[PDB]
Structure 1
Amino acid sequence: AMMKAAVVRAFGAPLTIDEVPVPQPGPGQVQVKIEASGVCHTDLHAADGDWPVKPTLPFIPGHEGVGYVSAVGSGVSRVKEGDRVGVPWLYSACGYCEHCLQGWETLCEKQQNTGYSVNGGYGEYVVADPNYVGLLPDKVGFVEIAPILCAGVTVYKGLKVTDTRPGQWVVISGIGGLGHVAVQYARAMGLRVAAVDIDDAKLNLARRLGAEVAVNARDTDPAAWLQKEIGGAHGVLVTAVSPKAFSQAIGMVRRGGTIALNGLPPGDFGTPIFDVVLKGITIRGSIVGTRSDLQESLDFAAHGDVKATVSTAKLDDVNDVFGRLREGKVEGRVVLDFSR
């Protein structure tokens, strides 16, 4: 069989929509027929090769792909034909290293990554390791659930590692794909939410989704504004694609506070070490989520606590989507629709 897929063949170049072979599932593998496929900013980073560790060319991006198990190899019991599943960033892990045994498989040094080191969901079919796919809730459709496969799980875990508790203030910096669902997860976790971005439309989105307070960093110093407004936050989750937002976030927290980092813009960010030490601040990188994180994050969507803001696009228009996302002209998430 042949299939349509969007392929990266050179960093910086537009993706090409080509006919490629349908991947077949070997032993212990499953095949997934894609019905929807979220566009993550990471996909831009990957196609631009602006990260230290590059994807091997060529490749098909996409780690927010969801659909049906359309075929099953041998020795597979976790899922069966017809099951609704998603294939996330964490494609697979070794399962027995120290990290994996501790239930921190997101840290597995032997992990594979969907739509980066292996081909992803920007296509009609994708092969997956059934041991690491998301098991989708029956009551949420493909288009709405797709973003939870990365945006959702990531910020859910990110919020967990801020070490904030119900009643406390958390700041979400960057109300994009990750950010806009981050606001919703925070409320579901009993947190009071403040939002920071550089575009009023984003802040308006945050306001609708539960943000009690919101500030535009292009209009004022957000750190100073937040210190005055709420006395500083107990936690911050940075999803912004700007190193500047990382530095600013550090000045947003109360003493003893924690800043968790999701965003992956190239380079360093300026860190006021003196204040971090004097104020006992924690800065903490968070990387997607374990299978347990993933399952829990899907359950919040299933219960209606989190609903992704989504607009659809066609596979063929993937380069336009990339352009819009790059220009910050996307509200929430774009999901590629493969439905009939």
Structure 2
Amino acid sequence: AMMKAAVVRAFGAPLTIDEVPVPQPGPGQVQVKIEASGVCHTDLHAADGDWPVKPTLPFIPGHEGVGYVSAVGSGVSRVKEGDRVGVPWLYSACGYCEHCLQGWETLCEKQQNTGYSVNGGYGEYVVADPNYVGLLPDKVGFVEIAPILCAGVTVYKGLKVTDTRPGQWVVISGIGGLGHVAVQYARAMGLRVAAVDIDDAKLNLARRLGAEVAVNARDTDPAAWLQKEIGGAHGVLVTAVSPKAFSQAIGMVRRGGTIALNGLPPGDFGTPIFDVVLKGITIRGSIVGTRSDLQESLDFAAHGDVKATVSTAKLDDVNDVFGRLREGKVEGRVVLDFSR
């Protein structure tokens, strides 16, 4: 009837670990006993209110929560008790609007978002819509599979809308939580990978995961450096948390190329309209992934083409994590482990 859970109550203030009531699945709902729970940079963005539309206080964050179905509301037909599932950013959608009908539920205006508009995986249990949960492969442990619930599907989908094809060069900008799995998805999709970040250790993580080439934007110029090394990229995926770089990216691509954007730092970035028009460049925002995207991203994980580099932490360690994530001191992803 009661559960441990990390709750946000003030934008900018440390999360408190409290013992709140356990959510109960009504008709058409399910309950999930959380086994592991990934920490996304989005969680930071939320807890501080970096965004135009802010979460409602108080709430439990976490949209990379994974575990077992521990209760099944009325008439649930897609999942049964004991099912291995995850609860991603896209908590639910309406299912019949133009977006939803075209398989673009990620754009649904009636969508609810896990760990934001509704409570998420930073708790021992969480109620979910069984129609939008990720169905997890048994062969991958909860801790390893957790980051795929967002970092994975996001960059998988991001790479898809770069409109690049096998044999072509793609640039991953920002080799962090999203970045480091993006390199892996790219290679599995037959692409050649170039990497850029501000820390040489993150570039080395990239090189190990498959990237053929890397650059430190802090050193010399990333764009210019890339035009010389590979003759510009066919595509670019931006997972960086800095507005600048959202600008340097437009210069790393060859004419007719496409830059896909995953990062969500507040503010604008400078777009050279003249060159964009003259070089026929495409800039494209990519928001997480649909249910099919998610299932496919999970499939890559299942086959071992993608393995997330994760650090373990305890629910109680929540705030220590946030700090180091802000400090850019995290290698890959941090995952809260509930295994008591």
| Structure 1 length-normalised TM | 1.00
Taking the aligned partners of 2:54 and 2:30, their CA distance within structure 1 comes to 26
- Equivalent in the alignment of 2:214: 214
Alpha-carbon offset, residue 9 of structure 1: 0.1
User: SS in structure 2 opposite 1:155?
Assistant: helix
Alpha-carbon offset, residue 305 of structure 1: 0.1
- For residues 175-205 of structure 1, give each alpha carbon's deviation from its aligned partner in whole angstroms, at most 9, with x where no partner exists: 0000000000000000000000000110010
Alpha-carbon offset, residue 316 of structure 1: 0.3
Taking the aligned partners of 1:290 and 1:4, their CA distance within structure 2 comes to 30
- Equivalent in the alignment of 1:147: 147
Taking the aligned partners of 1:90 and 1:68, their CA distance within structure 2 comes to 18
Taking the aligned partners of 2:195 and 2:33, their CA distance within structure 1 comes to 37
- For residues 58-107 of structure 1, give each alpha carbon's deviation from its aligned partner in whole angstroms, at most 9, with x where no partner exists: 00000000000000000101001101000000000000000000000000
Taking the aligned partners of 2:145 and 2:169, their CA distance within structure 1 comes to 27
- Equivalent in the alignment of 1:307: 307
- For residues 13-71 of structure 1, give each alpha carbon's deviation from its aligned partner in whole angstroms, at most 9, with x where no partner exists: 00000000000000000000000000000000000101001001100000000000000
Unaligned runs of 5+ in 1: none
Taking the aligned partners of 1:220 and 1:286, their CA distance within structure 2 comes to 28
Alpha-carbon offset, residue 334 of structure 1: 0.2
Taking the aligned partners of 1:148 and 1:91, their CA distance within structure 2 comes to 15
User: SS in structure 2 opposite 1:244?
Assistant: coil
Alignment size in residue pairs: 340
Question: RMSD between aligned alpha carbons?
Answer: 0.4
Taking the aligned partners of 2:219 and 2:7, their CA distance within structure 1 comes to 39
Alpha-carbon offset, residue 174 of structure 1: 0.3
Taking the aligned partners of 1:288 and 1:45, their CA distance within structure 2 comes to 15
Tell me if 1:225 matches 2:220.
Answer: no
User: SS in structure 2 opposite 1:178?
Assistant: helix
Alpha-carbon offset, residue 138 of structure 1: 1.2
Taking the aligned partners of 1:75 and 1:267, their CA distance within structure 2 comes to 44
Taking the aligned partners of 2:137 and 2:43, their CA distance within structure 1 comes to 25
User: SS in structure 2 opposite 1:231?
Assistant: coil
Taking the aligned partners of 2:176 and 2:116, their CA distance within structure 1 comes to 21
Alpha-carbon offset, residue 140 of structure 1: 0.4
Q: How does 1:63-78 map to 2 (within 5 A)?
A: 63-78=63-78
- Equivalent in the alignment of 1:254: 254
User: SS in structure 2 opposite 1:38?
Assistant: strand
Taking the aligned partners of 1:53 and 1:260, their CA distance within structure 2 comes to 23
- Equivalent in the alignment of 1:100: 100
Unaligned runs of 5+ in 2: none
Identical aligned residues as a percent: 100
Taking the aligned partners of 1:243 and 1:144, their CA distance within structure 2 comes to 30
- For residues 235-267 of structure 1, give each alpha carbon's deviation from its aligned partner in whole angstroms, at most 9, with x where no partner exists: 000000000010000000000000000000000
Taking the aligned partners of 2:36 and 2:109, their CA distance within structure 1 comes to 29
